[PDB]
Each structure stands twice: as structure tokens, then as C-alpha cells.
A = this chain, B = another copy of it.
Amino acid sequence: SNFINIHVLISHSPSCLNRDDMNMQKDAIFGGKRRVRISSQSLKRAMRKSGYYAQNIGESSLRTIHLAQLRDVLRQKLGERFDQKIIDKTLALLSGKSVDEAEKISADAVTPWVVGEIAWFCEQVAKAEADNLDDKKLLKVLKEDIAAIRVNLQQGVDIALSGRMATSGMMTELGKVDGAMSIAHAITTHQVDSDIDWFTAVDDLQEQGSAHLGTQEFSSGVFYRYANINLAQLQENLGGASREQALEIATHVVHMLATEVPGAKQRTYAAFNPADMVMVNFSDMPLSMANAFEKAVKAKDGFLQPSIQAFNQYWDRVANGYGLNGAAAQFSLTAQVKQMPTLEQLKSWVRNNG
């Protein structure tokens, strides 16, 4: 049972949690009908930058493209630990760019960094410098053992979970990370014809009408959040961490997925809703439950109840047809599915490997 699948039928309220360049709600055609959409990267950053992450998992990675700014940040944070030359050289070797007193140094693309990782590398560079070991041989011997660097990734779990991509520097050979997890886009269970808010900006110094006018798309929705954790990949991405540790990270993710909501336009629409259902299918191969809502769900006393009924029915069907055993454990507000009356009860059920 390598795969842990998280299904979340989080019901929401009127808002604009995620929009595009036209300031309009992101959407997606599914089942032939328009659904409101929240991009996976939005959920991922929402969780990554949340307080719960900061207190239950740790510090999130520093994703940047500016190497001058990163050079200064590192010179400050690691200045009492290493000499300036060591830090510079380490950054240059890791990025593939030359680090001098230039005000503008750009990496190839946006790259996620971890300060602990860079410190580790700085130690390596120091020792290599002492042994008169050139950067090629250094790259070789470093490439010989990857696990340690992934411990240094124990200090940046968002990377270990959602992967990293390199195109320059030693990172190419040393920092290529394949994401542990796997997270879908957020899709609404039902057809949505979005509403438009006609807004106005009244000038307290204008005799005529408002100084500004406009529109803003918004709507409510019963979304379906899906994610899974690849787990073995997680243990690997953290330096060979224990299965228990991985399950801890996974439970944290479950909680956030049932809890965290993108802070977009919430200051004026406030859709601070909790998940009205969580279902953590412990399993063997990644299995999404989105097809439960392929046939768009029609409202019968709200959208929530028939959404959940659909989810459960389809889950029973897939479980029966593909002989899909393995731990289940739902949770809400099929007998093989242990019912959990509390979220914490579910999380503890997951920590205990189902």
C-alpha cells in the first residue's frame, strides 16, 4: 500500500478564490458542463505559505530567480557560519551563474531553494577547497551520495512534495527532485453559471457619479479537491526517512487539504469555509474520484448532499468492480469504510498506517 489518496468534497460560499488575467473565475469544462476551477498551484502555494504549515511542518522553500538578492539573503543568514567567498562559490556552483557584486544576476528560471541545503553544500565546498579538489571531482563525489542532500530537503518539505526542476549548475545532477504527493485541480461538482457583481467606487470629492465603475465575476461552489501522496518517493525525497515520518507529513497534508483556502479576494467575499467532507482512501494505486461527478450533479436541497451521495455511490462502484480493497476511513458531517466522527480521529487513523 504505497499510495495514500485524499478526497475532499469541500463545499464553498460566494467568492472568487482563483481568477485569471481577465480577473475572471478560472473554469474547466467537465461532463460537458462548465465548472469553476481552482488551480493546483494555487492550493499548493496556499498550503505552503499557511501558518499551519509553518507550525506543523516547518519553513517553506525560498522560490526565486534573482540570484543577487539570494546572494545577499544568504550572505546575511549564513554570514556568521561561512566566509563570504565560500557562500558565493557555493551559490555559483549550484546555479551555474557567476556571483559577483553585480546588482542584477538572474538564474535560468524560478527555482526553489533551501537555506539548510545550501549550508550543507557550503560545508562540502569548504572541505573540497581544503583538499585542493576541483569542482569536477567535487561534483562527482557529491553525485555519489544523494540521500544526504535529501535530508537537507527534510528542511523543505514543499519541495520534497511538489518537486524541483534544474537546468544549470550542479543542481542539474544534484537537485533534480520528483514530487512525492500528486495534486489535482479543484473542480466544482456541478454546473456553474457565474454571477457578476456590479461594483462602484464613490469619490467623496466628486459631485457626479462614482469616480469608478466596474464588474467582478463570482460564484459559490461545491468543489472536489483531490490529491494523493506517493509515499516511497516521499521517504526517498527526505533522505530515506521513516514510513512513520512520511505518514506524519501525509496527515498534515490531509488536514491542510480539508482546511486551507486560497486567500484570493477573501478580504471582500470571505469564503472561509471548512471541508464538509473528507475521505482518505488508503490504497495501492493512485485513484481519483472525479468521475463521480462526470455526470454533473444536480441540486436537490443544495448541492452538498447529492454531491456526497454521488461520491459514495461511485466509490462503492469502483471498489466493487476493480476489487479495490485496502483501508478506507471516510468522515462526514460501504461497510469497508470506517466512519470517523472527528477530523483528528481520521488523522490519527492515518498516522497509524490505516
Contact = CB atoms under 8 A, between A and B. Distances in A.
B13 A184 contact: yes
A31 B13 CA distance: 9
A270 B299 contact: no
A82 B63 CA distance: 46
Contacts of A295: 301-302, 304-305
Interface string A317-334: 110111100000001010
Given A32-B303, A197-B39, A201-B110, A162 B343 contact: no
A163 B33 CA distance: 37
A33 to B, nearest CB: 7
A287 B267 contact: no
Interface string A8-22: 000101100000110
A195 B28 contact: yes
B288 A296 contact: no
Interface in A192-219: 193, 195, 197-199, 201-206, 211-213, 218-219
Q: How many copies does the complex hold?
A: 2
Interface stretch (A66-74, A94-102, A126-134): A66-74
Given A193-B29, A220-B28, A302-B32, A14 B187 contact: yes
A37 B295 CA distance: 22
Contact of A66 (B203, B266, B268): B203
Nearest to A299: B32
B212 A109 contact: yes
Given A63-B203, A66-B203, A269-B185, A290 B13 contact: yes
A290 to B, nearest CB: 4
Nearest to A278: B321
B323 A66 contact: no
A121 interface: no
The 8 closest A-B pairs by CB, nearest first: A32-B299, A184-B270, A20-B198, A295-B302, A13-B290, A31-B302, A272-B286, A64-B205
Given A14-B37, A321-B341, 16 more contacts: A14-B30, A26-B198, A29-B193, A29-B220, A31-B301, A32-B190, A52-B285, A63-B203, A110-B201, A110-B212, A184-B271, A228-B270, A270-B286, A294-B302, A296-B302, A322-B343
